[PDB]
Each structure stands twice: as structure tokens, then as C-alpha cells.
Design a protein around this ligand. Structure first.
Ligand SMILES: C=CC1=C(C)/C(=C/c2[nH]c(/C=C3N=C(/C=C4\NC(=O)C(C)=C4C=C)C(C)=C\3CCC(=O)O)c(CCC(=O)O)c2C)NC1=O
Ligand SMILES: *[C@@H]1O[C@H](CO)[C@@H](O[C@@H]2O[C@H](CO)[C@@H](O)[C@H](O)[C@H]2NC(C)=O)[C@H](O)[C@H]1NC(C)=O
Ligand SMILES: *[C@@H]1O[C@H](CO)[C@@H](O[C@@H]2O[C@H](CO)[C@@H](O)[C@H](O)[C@H]2NC(C)=O)[C@H](O)[C@H]1NC(C)=O
Ligand SMILES: *[C@@H]1O[C@H](CO)[C@@H](O)[C@H](O)[C@H]1NC(C)=O
Ligand SMILES: *[C@@H]1O[C@H](CO)[C@@H](O)[C@H](O)[C@H]1NC(C)=O
Ligand SMILES: *[C@@H]1O[C@H](CO)[C@@H](O)[C@H](O)[C@H]1NC(C)=O
Ligand SMILES: *[C@@H]1O[C@H](CO)[C@@H](O)[C@H](O)[C@H]1NC(C)=O
Ligand SMILES: *[C@@H]1O[C@H](CO)[C@@H](O)[C@H](O)[C@H]1NC(C)=O
Ligand SMILES: *[C@@H]1O[C@H](CO)[C@@H](O)[C@H](O)[C@H]1NC(C)=O
Lengths: 49, 285, 49
């Protein structure tokens, strides 16, 4: 996926964040203590005429 | 060095209603703006909890209580009277026992074969020469052998002076013993309420995950005694109790619907199968 | 050493170091060995042969 900057504020005991579908949205980068949002990089319908 | 305490006035045990209290974060996964349904050991909502209040006016209580699949322990304080717990089965050195204590300098967590005293307590002494308190007495256990787990926190000092007025600190704990792990969830809130448990919501955060491997069925709270020139007699009577209170409830396996707000905080919850309306709220999510 | 007698099975990741006398029979043992009163721990006999 695509990793972007995040406004989420993780509690110190948290490492991952999840949707209601249990797929990982946000992750705390273990090197630099910042939160990165993960987005699927495939998106959008396509039709052939 | 342990001594029993004789100057007591017996009272029937008081009971209080816990109003949507004792919720903790079930896992360590961030969730925001979601209605998450979980099943875990929770204190049921609107539940009757036993109330033990230590006051002088002398009425103070530290009995050995059951540990039924986990304990919710709230404490309203203004002068740091409740300062730890004892967990075990027999509490008489035949079996291993767990001791969590804040002795005003360190937090000590020891799993160890303690020979516990019938009235275990700590003791602070008032000085008339200078307006200062120091902790003097540590009468928890007589002997300690075969001493498995030990943790000592970094040194500190806390305000053990006896405050006068209203209760200020509410410290909430959830203890559970699952698969050899003693899990503690904690939460401290500032309050200004006088008698009962505050009405509101506050989610307890994970603190520890101690690998003690201990059978636990009973537990006992450790309190602190003021001793002053105003209290005459020997060590068994020459003492007074600062004003504090604690509340004990028992966890049950329950399904809860937790609401995580946009900042990732559990702001509200529904105890499922409390009443049929709560079941409807569960089904509708 | 290993524990040979216990009143009930251990819970997972539970440790029992108690050395109380096991009452296999009906009469209490009162902290002394004898008939139907066993020391719970027994030592492995490990020989190279
Ligand atoms: C009993 C074991 C015990 C536990 C589990 C505990 C947890 C605990 N208490 C804290 C604050 C604190 N805890 C206390 C005192 C207490 N808080 C309590 O739950 C109890 C029982 C006392 C003792 C009476 C005080 C005075 C502070 C600092 C509050 C302040 O900033 O004024 C902190 C935050 C420390 C930090 O800032 O990094 C933790 C983790 N403290 C303990 O002593
Ligand atoms: C509170 O408990 C801790 C641990 O028992 C005490 O700290 C130890 O004290 C002994 C004797 O002075 C020392 O040998 C240890 O090195 C200390 N261990 C530490 C600081 O980690 C402490 O003294 C106690 N404090 C009070 C007021 O009772
Ligand atoms: C954990 O501790 C409890 C209390 O010691 C044990 O339950 C007791 O087991 C004996 C067996 O004879 C009974 O006589 C008691 O009546 C029981 N008391 C209670 C409160 O249950 C329990 O067996 C221990 N569990 C493990 C795995 O060791
Ligand atoms: C090395 O570890 C520290 C954390 O202790 C961290 O600040 C630092 O970013 C790490 N080095 C690199 C190149 O990330
Ligand atoms: C009183 O103290 C003695 C030893 O200090 C102890 O054996 C006994 O159990 C105590 N009795 C009570 C009621 O606390
Ligand atoms: C249980 O809750 C009720 C309040 O509905 C209370 O009257 C009762 O005292 C509590 N249980 C006990 C044993 O006191
Ligand atoms: C001052 O207070 C400390 C402990 O609070 C005490 O040990 C000391 O004796 C006091 N100073 C005098 C002169 O009494
Ligand atoms: C328990 O304590 C007794 C007496 O000190 C000792 O004989 C025994 O070896 C100890 N067992 C363990 C596991 O420490
Ligand atoms: C979430 O955090 C922000 C701080 O940037 C704060 O302004 C906001 O009030 C918080 N939201 C809630 C519901 O408390």
C-alpha cells in the first residue's frame, strides 16, 4: 500500500490500528516514533466500450 | 514484628452501585470512530460493589476477600492510605503469594512464599517538632523464602502527608489472572466527590502483564496507619486511620459494545445482556 | 525433581512449589509421612548408563 503521514495519536502501548474489517490502517514506525496511515493503492472502476 | 490491632468498631458491610464503571481496553490495537463488540471479563454495569471506608471520627476495614475470576478495585483518596495488595490462596507460607506495595519510595512486586500477618499494614508517624511525615512501620510479612519473582520500581517520593478536606484522587484497577499472567489495568482520575463512586465513564489502560504463575483465590488490601502524639497507647491501640475509601467488585464473562471516538478513546459502552434494551442496542450496533 | 502427586491438575503456565504432604487416603496426614501420606516431590534418577 501507500504510506502517508497521520494525525492519529497512538497510546504508548499500541503499535497497529485497524478498520472494522480488521485490516491494518495505521502503524507506528518502529525507528522514528511516528504514525503512518496505510492505504490500498488500487482504486477506481474501469469499463471497456 | 507484626502486631494485631484491637481498637475497632464492627459495622455491617456497605454496598454501592457502580454506574457504567470498570471498562478497560481489551487489546492493544488502535481503533477510532467505531462500535466494537468484544467478549471479556468485565464488571457488569449498574452492579453492587462492596464498600470499605477507613475513617477515625475508629472504623477501618481490610478483610480477606475472594478473587472470583478477577477484581475491580476503586479507591477514593486524599492522603495516600491504600498502598497495595496481597494475593494468594492461603496466605500462610504453605503456598506462593503475590505482594504489590508502594512503601512511599518504591513500588515492589514480589511473588514469593510469604508468612503473612493476620493484620498486615504500613505505618506513618506524625512529628510535632517539624511539620513532616515519614513512613516508619512495615508489618506486612514475617518471613519470605523461595522467592520467585521480584520487581522494584525506580526510587521516588510521594506526598504521604495527611490532607484535610475532600477526596481528590480516584484510582481504579482491574486485576485478572489468566494463563499464568497477572494482568493489571489502571486509571487515575482527579475528582471532588465526598462519599460514593463518581458517576461517569473512564476506560482503564493496560499497565502490567506479570508472569507469576500463581493460583489466586483470595486477596487483601494493605492500608496505612497514622501514628501521632494525639494517639496514646501501645502499637496495637496508639494509632489513627486517615480518611479513605475503596470499593470491590467482581468481573464476569460479559459481551460489551465499546464506542471508540475519533481520537481512539473508549468514551462509552453498553453492557450487553444487562437488560433487553441493551440487547437491542447490541443487535443494532 | 518432579511432582508426582497433586490434588488437581495445574492450570496452564502455573507453578506449584509447595511441599505439603499429599493425603492419598482418607485420614489426614498432619504434616508427617506414613501410609497413604506421600511426599509430593520425587527425584529423577539420572545415570549415564
Ligand atoms: C500500588 C502499586 C502502584 C501502582 C500499580 C502504580 C501505578 C502508577 N502510579 C502513577 C502515578 C502516581 N501514583 C501515586 C500513588 C499511588 N497510585 C496508586 O494506585 C496507589 C495505590 C498509590 C499509593 C498510595 C502518586 C502520588 C502518583 C503521582 C501523581 C502526581 O503527579 O501527583 C504512575 C505514573 C508514573 C509516571 O508518571 O511515569 C503509575 C504507572 N503506583 C503504585 O504505587
Ligand atoms: C521500600 O522497598 C524497597 C525494596 O525493599 C527498599 O529499597 C531497598 O532497601 C534496602 C535496604 O535499605 C536496600 O538494600 C536495597 O538496595 C533497596 N532496593 C532498591 C532501592 O531498589 C526501600 O528502602 C523501601 N523504602 C521504605 C521507605 O521503606
Ligand atoms: C487453587 O486454590 C484453591 C483453594 O486452595 C483450590 O480449591 C480448593 O481445592 C481443594 C481440593 O481438595 C478443596 O478442598 C477446596 O474446597 C477448594 N477451595 C476452593 C475455594 O475452590 C484449587 O484446587 C486450586 N487450583 C489449582 C489448579 O491448584
Ligand atoms: C536508531 O534508534 C533510535 C531510537 O532509540 C531512533 O531514534 C533512530 O531513528 C534509529 N536510527 C535510524 C537511522 O532510524
Ligand atoms: C494476634 O497476634 C498473634 C501473633 O502476633 C497471632 O498468632 C494471632 O493470629 C493474632 N490474632 C488476631 C485475631 O489477629
Ligand atoms: C446488591 O444490589 C442491591 C441494589 O439493587 C443492594 O440492595 C444489595 O445490598 C446488594 N447485595 C448485597 C449482598 O448487599
Ligand atoms: C524533622 O522530620 C524528620 C522526619 O519527618 C525527623 O526525623 C526529624 O527528627 C525532624 N527534625 C527534628 C529536629 O526533630
Ligand atoms: C523451599 O524452602 C525450603 C526451606 O528453605 C527448601 O528446603 C526448599 O528447597 C525450597 N524449595 C524451592 C523450590 O525453592
Ligand atoms: C482529540 O484531540 C484533539 C487535539 O488535537 C482535540 O482538539 C479534540 O478535542 C479531541 N477530541 C475529543 C472528542 O476529545
Amino acid at each position: 500500500g501507500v504510506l502517508t503521514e497521520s494525525n492519529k495519536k497512538f497510546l504508548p502501548f499500541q503499535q497497529f490500528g485497524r478498520d472494522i474489517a480488521d485490516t491494518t490502517d495505521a502503524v507506528r514506525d518502529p525507528q522514528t516514533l511516528e504514525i503512518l496511515d496505510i492505504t490500498p493503492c488500487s482504486f477506481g472502476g474501469v469499463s471497456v466500450i | 514484628q507484626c502486631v494485631n490491632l484491637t481498637t475497632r468498631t464492627q459495622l455491617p458491610p456497605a454496598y454501592t452501585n457502580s454506574f457504567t464503571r470498570g471498562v478497560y481496553y481489551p487489546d492493544k490495537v488502535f481503533r477510532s470512530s467505531v462500535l466494537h463488540s468484544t467478549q471479556d471479563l468485565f464488571l457488569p454495569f449498574f452492579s453492587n460493589v462492596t464498600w470499605f471506608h477507613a475513617i477515625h471520627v475508629k472504623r477501618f476495614d481490610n478483610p480477606v476477600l475472594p478473587f472470583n475470576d478477577g477484581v475491580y478495585f476503586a479507591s477514593t483518596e486524599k492522603s495516600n492510605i491504600i498502598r497495595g495488595w496481597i494475593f494468594g490462596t492461603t496466605l500462610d507460607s504453605k503456598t506462593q503469594s503475590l505482594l504489590i506495595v508502594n512503601n512511599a519510595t518504591n513500588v515492589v512486586i514480589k511473588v514469593c512464599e510469604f508468612q503473612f500477618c493476620n493484620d498486615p499494614f504500613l505505618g506513618v508517624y506524625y512529628h510535632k517538632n517539624n511539620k513532616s511525615w515519614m513512613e516508619s512501620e512495615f508489618r506486612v510479612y514475617s518471613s519470605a523464602n523461595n522467592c520467585t519473582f521480584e520487581y522494584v520500581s525506580q526510587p521516588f517520593l510521594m506526598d504521604l502527608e495527611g490532607k484535610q478536606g475532600n477526596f481528590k484522587n480516584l484510582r481504579e484497577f482491574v486485576f485478572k489472572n489468566i494463563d499464568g499472567y497477572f494482568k493489571i489495568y489502571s486509571k487515575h482520575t482527579p475528582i471532588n466527590l465526598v462519599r460514593d463512586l463518581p458517576q461517569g465513564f473512564s476506560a482503564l489502560e493496560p499497565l502490567v502483564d506479570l508472569p507469576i504463575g500463581i493460583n489466586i483465590t483470595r486477596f487483601q488490601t494493605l492500608l496505612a496507619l497514622h501514628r501521632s502524639y494525639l494517639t496514646p497507647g501501645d502499637s496495637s491501640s496508639g494509632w489513627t486511620a486517615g480518611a479513605a475509601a475503596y470499593y470491590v467488585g467482581y468481573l464476569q464473562p460479559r459481551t460489551f459494545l465499546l464506542k471508540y471516538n475519533e481520537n481512539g478513546t473508549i468514551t462509552d459502552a453498553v453492557d450487553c445482556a444487562l437488560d433487553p434494551l441493551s440487547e437491542t442496542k447490541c443487535t443494532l450496533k | 525433581l518432579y511432582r508426582l502427586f497433586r490434588k488437581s491438575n495445574l492450570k496452564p503456565f502455573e507453578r506449584d512449589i509447595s511441599t505439603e504432604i499429599y493425603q492419598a487416603g482418607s485420614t489426614p496426614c498432619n504434616g508427617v509421612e506414613g501410609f497413604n501420606c506421600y511426599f509430593p516431590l520425587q527425584s529423577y534418577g539420572f545415570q549415564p548408563t
